[PDB]
Specification:
monomer, mainly beta, Cathepsin D, subunit A, domain 1, 2 domains, seven-stranded mixed beta sheet, six-stranded mixed barrel, 4 helices, 44% strand, globular, EC 3.4.23.22, disulfide bond
Length: 330
């Protein structure tokens, strides 16, 4: 089997991407944030504290003839950005772009943190990291991909995120028309539960490539590109007037600037992030100070190849017995 679904930016800045997901019978379609940095499929629901729901579409398990409460199971998750959610668990039928999993754990939120409430466009998350990170207790549950894997034509999914435009998540096949040149594959460590890999270096603009190992995670659920302070400083030094602002929480730059591109290495291959991808707009409405899309990972404890990086590529998440990652230009 295969599946293919369009993923759409939630706003004009590509702060996140939502993908429609069918849950239950009859289908209840929710727009979920596909997150290769976590491993829970959780949804706003009829069980979510009413004051914490503000415009989201909810899953109502009592209206699904295939929903079954997973007795005694609870979940609770905290994300790198400080947000969190928790609740109980159903199993139900879940379909993405024509690919159907029966008995998928659907984690129903009883509580969500304010940032979730405040974002009306995201109805929940669909985790695509390794199932070892799943938070369901006392019996850990499998991700949608893990459940689908054996049925897929090939045990892979691909992320093709758009810049200010829709893109695609495919399951079970590689669309050879969706990228240019070849896909370069690179080793993955699953030891921390992530799609963790080592970039071979970077360049700023038309500058020389610096060969240096950068361990980080391919994370579709993180907006920005978080890299070591040395790398980030080298980037922003090429933007007149750019500075790190403790009050804002990162590098800012004059909105009048033209940003240089940023290249990262995948083996001997190179992925070029155009400068415009690194512009996250005014820090506050009407400001002429703009927020940067490349930020320091210092104090995160891990480098993160988030959407800023991934949307410059066609990305293969290869879930073979030994997982790997592939990157192509597009």
């Amino acid at each position: 089997s295969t599946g293919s679904a369009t993923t759409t930016p939630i706003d004009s800045l590509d702060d996140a991407y939502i993908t429609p997901v069918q849950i239950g019978t009859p289908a209840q379609t929710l727009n979920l944030d596909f997150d290769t940095g976590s491993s829970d499929l959780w949804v706003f629901s009829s069980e979510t504290t009413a004051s914490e729901v503000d415009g989201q579409t909810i899953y109502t398990p009592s209206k699904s003839t295939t929903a079954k409460l997973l007795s005694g199971a609870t979940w609770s998750i905290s994300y790198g950005d400080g947000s969190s959610s928790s609740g109980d668990v159903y199993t139900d039928t879940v379909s993405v772009g024509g690919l159907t999993v029966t008995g998928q754990a659907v984690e129903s939120a009883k509580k969500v943190s304010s940032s979730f409430t405040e974002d009306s466009t995201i109805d929940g998350l669909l985790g695509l990291a390794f199932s070892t990170l799943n938070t369901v207790s006392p019996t850990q549950q499998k991700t949608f991909f893990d459940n689908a894997k054996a049925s897929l034509d090939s045990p892979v999914f691909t992320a093709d995120l758009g810049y200010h435009a829709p893109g695609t998540y495919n399951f079970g096949f590689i669309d050879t028309t969706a990228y240019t040149g070849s896909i370069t594959y690179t080793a993955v460590s699953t030891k921390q539960g992530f799609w963790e890999w080592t970039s071979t270096g970077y360049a700023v603009g038309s500058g020389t490539f610096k060969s240096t190992s950068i361990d980080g995670i391919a994370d579709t659920g993180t907006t920005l590109l978080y890299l070591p302070a040395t790398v980030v400083s080298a980037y922003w030094a090429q933007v007149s007037g750019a500075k790190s602002s403790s009050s804002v929480g990162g590098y800012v730059f004059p909105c009048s600037a033209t940003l240089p591109s940023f290249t990262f290495g995948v083996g001997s291959a190179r992925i070029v992030i155009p400068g415009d991808y690194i512009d996250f707009g005014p820090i506050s409405t009407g400001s002429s100070s703009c927020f940067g899309g490349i930020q320091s990972s210092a104090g995160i404890g891990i480098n993160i190849f988030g959407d800023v990086a991934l949307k410059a590529a066609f990305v293969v998440f290869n879930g073979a017995t030994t997982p790997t990652l592939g990157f192509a230009s597009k």
